Design a protein around this ligand. Structure first.
Ligand code: CL
Ligand code: CL
Length: 287
């Protein structure tokens, strides 16, 4: 008799950290590692945080605590374990393919779970989800931009993909995940992707050259994540211009920060909620 909304109402009603088992993808549970600050009220923002390759959602949720306490944000980190969601295929790439290599419908992709969880937070009356912010670092920045390529944008007020290891390029020339072909996506998905004011957040010290995506499609985008971020940005610029479409993306370089999900989390919080880049002294503190 309990629904996911009922569960969320009971688990997210009080302040503090939590790890909420969630089952939507009938056979694949995951966890919401959450933080609710004292003084959270339902009108305040919800930040969805996506972990990188380590699948350390609890850690990512912890990185956002100081910003949540200052700004009264509800932090939700959908967490996909290596055991239940193995490999880049299940997490980074959204389980886009069946085992036979045929496309699954986009509402079955791992990405589509974000909006469902949000609808449940709203049905639980925990948050009205008017202003939802979506952040992902590394594998989770791969997840976020591919979510934006494949899913409705209505639930999301702001979206930042930080230091993705490599990118799905905005073109039907290559099969997903290298491009948008072979997965039932349309030119409308592409137009909506291009229009959205997504931030690509790139540390200019993310320039080390083992966990770095090293398949040929990743290598073609550049020697390191910082180069790849610039490559993605220009690819979107060209895709929009060849189509005469509006282009909403912003490339935001972070000076002196490398591949550091905690630093990139605090920079993102600063940009979104303080309206500013931290100063050099702060950035040096974070580095
Ligand atoms: Cl549901
Ligand atoms: Cl290839």
């Amino acid at each position: 008799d309990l629904t996911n909304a009922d569960r969320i109402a009971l688990e997210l009603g009080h302040a503090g950290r939590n790890a909420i088992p969630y089952l939507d993808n009938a056979d694949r549970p995951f966890t919401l590692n959450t933080y609710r600050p004292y003084g959270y009220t339902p009108d305040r923002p919800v930040v969805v945080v996506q972990h990188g390759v380590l699948r350390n959602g609890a850690d990512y949720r912890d990185f956002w605590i100081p910003a949540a306490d200052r700004h009264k944000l509800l932090i939700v980190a959908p967490t996909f374990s290596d055991e239940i969601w193995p490999g880049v295929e299940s997490y980074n790439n959204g389980r886009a393919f069946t085992a036979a290599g045929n496309p699954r419908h986009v509402d079955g992709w791992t990405y589509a779970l974000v909006a469902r969880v949000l609808a449940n937070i709203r049905a639980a009356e925990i948050a009205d989800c008017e202003q939802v912010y979506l952040f992902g670092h590394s594998a989770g920045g791969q997840f976020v931009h591919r979510l934006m390529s494949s899913q409705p944008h209505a639930p999301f007020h702001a979206v930042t993909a930080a230091n993705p290891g490599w990118y799905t390029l905005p073109t039907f020339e290559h099969r997903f995940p290298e491009g948008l072909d072979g997965v039932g996506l349309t030119e409308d998905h592409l137009a909506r992707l291009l229009a959205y004011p997504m931030t690509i957040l790139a540390g200019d010290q993310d320039i080390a050259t083992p966990n770095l995506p090293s398949e040929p499609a990743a290598l073609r985008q550049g020697p390191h994540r910082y180069a790849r971020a610039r490559h993605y940005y220009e690819a979107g610029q060209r895709a929009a211009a060849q189509r005469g479409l509006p282009f909403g993306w912003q490339l935001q370089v972070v000076p002196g920060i490398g591949h550091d999900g905690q630093a990139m989390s605090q920079v993102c919080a600063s940009l979104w909620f303080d309206g500013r880049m931290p100063d050099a002294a702060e950035l040096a503190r974070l580095a």
